[PDB]
């Protein structure tokens, strides 16, 4: 009785915090799309339906999105699969050559500038002894002038190699379900209001994460998951300024984006069994790519976020916005992909307002680059193939990424500027509800029973 | 429409209950512990790390007196300096998480004590079957 005996218990429901790898699983309709044109189907295992997600009660668990892992190895894995999607593809080492470029056939404005150049150059053939003369079109933002006459070259060709993407593979997202191996569990904060740090009483475990589509957007995170009822703002330390501010706003707001130009491609055989695609002729009106959003929706959503900001910055506070300060071309804008072709599209028509403590649209112009260095690699670049026709796409704008300015010296206006920088902000806007825990069985406890012999 | 007893009997469902009622399920936790061009390497070391963990725990039970019983006893009394809690309150008051954070310092003493106690039990049983 009073001689209490210690007894073990194997399989005690209990866990600790840990960090481990994951399990990449999608649906079988990605495998319906055949011949590996979808990336993440070589390694990505097919999912299961009706995944177990059961509630847990009388439970207090502290979460953190900022000291969270699994955004780190996800940022590893996506660039890893990105490089796995290039080793079958083709190099452009024979292409870096002297370019005889000139202005495209257009009524030219002497003061504005056209953004398409007609470049003729020597190129190899199927056979070695035969050289050929071929022309194509390029944007202004990928050639530079070398030195009378005019001769250009590609910008990467002094400093890096270059790889064409295979036109089989697409760049649309598919939902990636992350899962944990046996011996680990994944938790989820089911609370309505959760700024991102501290306890969450409403939690539930899960076996596999929900649908996550991988986007690439330097500002203005697109097609993401949206909040329940309020507009929520999240940060690590709001009084710190250089740390960003994530803004998950409730209602989605539509965007149209297009390039109105009709586009012909042209195959160019580089060598034996090689291929290359280039912008041939442009039929129709030489126009400029752009995007549109609805005026009053943008006004109302900004009213909601200004309503939500003033809890943190004093109730009698003036809040205004500015365009982003500068830096790289792909952080002065938001930078996205549409139909497998990139856009760097000016955002100064949005963040130019002010707010007081009391059928139209918004159009904004874009630019189109072909060669990129996304994630800013050291000698690695990527060509993007020209695609046919006239491209438009419609996306639900989900969140924002902001930065408070360094406002000292007696200021009541606390203006904001949108700046993304790291992609891990975009990713941390998605896995903020989750964390990974390790099961440790074989707990132990006294009770009143002695083993006989 | 699904019933609440099923998600009580689900995996890690009884994490919030008292430990006396959480005793009524261990097999689901035990079962979900086990199993249920470059990437298969990571897959494969995850799987063998899981089974390495499982074999470590099975060996820790195997050197102890109980192998498949999943509910055991022994012959070392509970030191009241470890807990000084009432016997009634521990089974109907606390959860396993806070029990773990209470007894988490008193670790690797009890392990070696179980090893020593049943080693002595092994030599006693050998002596009793040797005299017979």
């Amino acid at each position: 009785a009073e001689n209490l005996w210690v007894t073990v218990y194997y399989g005690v429901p209990v866990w600790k915090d840990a960090e481990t790898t994951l399990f990449c699983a999608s649906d079988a309709k990605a495998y319906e799309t055949e011949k590996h044109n979808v990336w993440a189907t070589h390694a990505c295992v097919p999912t299961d339906p009706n995944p177990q997600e059961i509630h847990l009660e009388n439970v207090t668990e502290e979460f953190n999105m900022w000291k969270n892992n699994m955004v780190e190895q996800m940022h590893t894995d996506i660039i890893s699969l990105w490089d796995q999607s290039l080793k079958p593809c083709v190099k452009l080492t024979p292409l870096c050559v002297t370019l005889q470029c000139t202005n495209v056939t257009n009524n030219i404005t002497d003061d504005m500038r056209g953004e398409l150049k007609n470049c003729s150059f020597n190129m190899t053939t199927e056979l070695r002894d035969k050289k050929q003369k071929v022309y194509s079109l390029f944007y202004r933002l990928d050639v530079v002038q070398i030195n009378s006459n005019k001769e250009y070259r590609l910008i990467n060709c002094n400093t890096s190699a270059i790889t064409q993407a295979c036109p089989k593979v697409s760049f649309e997202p598919i939902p990636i379900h992350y899962c944990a191996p046996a011996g680990f569990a994944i938790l989820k904060c089911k609370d309505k209001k959760f700024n991102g740090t501290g306890p969450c009483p409403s939690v539930s475990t899960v076996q596999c994460t929900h649908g996550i589509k991988p986007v690439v957007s330097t500002q203005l995170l697109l097609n993401g998951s949206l909040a329940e009822e309020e507009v929520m703002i999240r940060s690590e330390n709001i009084t710190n300024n250089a740390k960003n501010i994530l803004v998950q706003f409730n209602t989605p707001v539509q965007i149209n984006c297009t390039r109105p130009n009709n586009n012909t491609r042209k195959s160019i055989r580089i060598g034996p069994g090689q291929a290359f695609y280039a912008t041939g002729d442009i039929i129709g009106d030489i126009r400029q790519a752009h995007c549109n959003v609805s005026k009053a929706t943008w006004n109302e959503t900004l009213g909601k976020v200004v309503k939500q900001l003033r809890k943190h910055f004093g109730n009698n506070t003036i809040i205004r916005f500015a365009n982003s300060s500068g830096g790289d071309l792909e952080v002065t804008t938001h930078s996205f992909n549409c139909g497998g072709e990139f856009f760097y599209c000016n955002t100064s028509g949005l963040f130019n307002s002010t707010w007081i403590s009391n059928n139209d649209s918004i159009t904004l112009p874009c630019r189109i680059k072909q060669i990129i260095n996304m994630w800013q690699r050291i000698g690695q670049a990527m060509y993007a193939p020209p695609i046919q026709g006239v491209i438009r796409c419609v996306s639900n704008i989900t969140g924002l990424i902001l930065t408070r300015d360094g406002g000292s010296t007696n200021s009541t206006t606390e203006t904001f500027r949108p700046g993304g920088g790291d992609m891990r902000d975009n990713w941390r806007s998605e896995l903020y509800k989750y964390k990974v825990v390790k099961i440790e069985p074989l707990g132990v406890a006294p009770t009143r029973c002695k083993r006989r012999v | 429409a699904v019933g609440i007893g099923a998600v009580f009997l689900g995996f890690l469902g009884a994490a919030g209950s008292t430990m006396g009622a959480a005793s009524m399920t261990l097999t689901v936790q035990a079962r979900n512990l086990l199993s249920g061009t470059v990437w298969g390497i990571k897959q494969l070391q995850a799987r063998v790390l899981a089974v390495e963990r499982y074999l470590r725990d099975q060996q820790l039970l195997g050197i102890w007196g109980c192998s498949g019983k999943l509910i055991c006893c022994t012959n070392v009394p509970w030191n009241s300096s470890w807990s000084n809690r009432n016997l009634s309150e521990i089974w109907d008051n606390m959860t396993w998480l806070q029990w773990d954070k209470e007894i988490s310092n008193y670790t690797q003493i009890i392990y070696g004590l179980l090893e020593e106690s049943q080693n002595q039990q092994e030599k006693n049983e050998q002596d009793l079957l040797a005299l017979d």
Partner: antibody
Amino acid sequence: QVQLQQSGTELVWPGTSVTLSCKASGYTFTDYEIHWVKQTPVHGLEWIGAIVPKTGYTAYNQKFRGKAILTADKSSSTAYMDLRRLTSEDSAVYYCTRLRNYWYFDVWGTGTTVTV
Amino acid sequence: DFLMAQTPLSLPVSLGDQASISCRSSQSIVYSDGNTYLEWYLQRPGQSPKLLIYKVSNRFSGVPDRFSGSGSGTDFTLRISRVEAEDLGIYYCFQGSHVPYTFGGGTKLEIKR
């Protein structure tokens, strides 16, 4: 016969506490899971919580967290819902109802209006 | 959490005509046993909610074959072959697959002239 004999209609003050009863009638109490359904005119129906009759295992909606407390009597076969520190939104119709696991609600009680 | 958007939220329709309610979930509310535990209720104004449809293809024991249900994954459809004065009340799509359970908005059945 098979009926959820509920409590009486309660007309209470703000901030008080009250207990709503639900006697199982005509069947085996100790196996059929008891649920509680809030009925306001503004929201319609809401899930309050649930209690296992045999073990007393409860689970509550996040809205009702600390607002409602479920007990059960195996002797009198009667579920009890303690409602504490009442506000005017508690002025509603509370339905006692029962199921078995992986099945539906068959029996529906009277529906007790509690007006704060 | 697994919320239910019930369209419509009130059904005025004459007697003898069919009825169709599309209740759409946020995502898959299927439990691990494969069954999509959606339930449809009828609370008359002044009476308790009598169950119409559980286990969407199935019907309540006693509720006639006029009633029926279909729908999967997200998009769910209560169907009635003919609307009666006995059918009147409020209809409910109800996620019965996980705790916390969620009700829909309800659909007040009435008569349109």
